[PDB]
Amino acid sequence: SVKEFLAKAKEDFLKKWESPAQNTAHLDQFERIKTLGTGSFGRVMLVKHKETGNHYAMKILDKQKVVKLKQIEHTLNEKRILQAVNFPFLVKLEFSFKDNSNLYMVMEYVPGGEMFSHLRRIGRFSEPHARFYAAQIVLTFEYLHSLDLIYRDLKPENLLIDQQGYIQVTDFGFAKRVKGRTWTLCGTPEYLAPEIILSKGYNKAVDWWALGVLIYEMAAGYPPFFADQPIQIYEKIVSGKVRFPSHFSSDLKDLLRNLLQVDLTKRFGNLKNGVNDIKNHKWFATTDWIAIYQRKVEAPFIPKFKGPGDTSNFDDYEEEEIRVSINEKCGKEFSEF
């Protein structure tokens, strides 16, 4: 059953969790090709592994910048968790290493580009299109949460479309293993649950709220709570009054009212029936959950793939020289990486 799958999944995860892979490649093994994305303290580049000719996305984090932004522990979380998990819709970490200046996470390259890119361009997804992606997040969160993991950064920018049109979740920078509650104010404004904003201490239920935000944004073409500045976004979230496009079906609205539920005793995903309140909701009536996991369902959208290591589905970013100091930086802080 689901329970059986999950029990076995957990056993595999804990082995890697307790004994993480470390220093499994070196910079000189990769040819650097192109920047695919940037973040507050680093960049992700398309690289080619010289000995296999495989393409990977190499996330390069400047140690000194991580330290300045107080993301040391989050960064250690990310690598330790990412190296340990295994789910069809989770991007795979293939290698990790560090040098005098940087940390490196070499991950599977997902050529179809960000959901963000396609969503913005097309405007909004049909309900069946949105339902397809949503189901994959439902299962991914069922998996992560069963491992006591909170993801904490669901948004289209972090969901890549693979060559078969299925989702790959990336960016585990805020992922955290925690039993009970946690308090870090982190995430992206549009997607924060009310309890995060209110410093109430929070749990996995924030991911189910974020799911509510994602489905709304996918189906409407804009998020349920937006403004020009984050503070204004928080005020909208906390009041929690949500208006739905007139094209939203009755089922969709009912599902969203239960996900975008301020009352934790009522928020779907968080009740006695757990994720089943969601899987069995009317909006998902047409969803075959096993077919989704098995990747047997036909994707509403297949990205254009002009060749191996092609980057047409990504935006262009300014390229910077990757410099490595002749002195070790922040060795102690990242000793476990």
Partner: peptide, 19 residues
């Protein structure tokens, strides 16, 4: 329309995480 309001807003680009 709400769509028009969104498109004209400053947050249709990639949204950064907060720390």
């Amino acid at each position: 329309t709400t769509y028009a309001d969104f498109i004209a807003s400053g947050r249709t680009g990639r949204r950064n995480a907060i720390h």
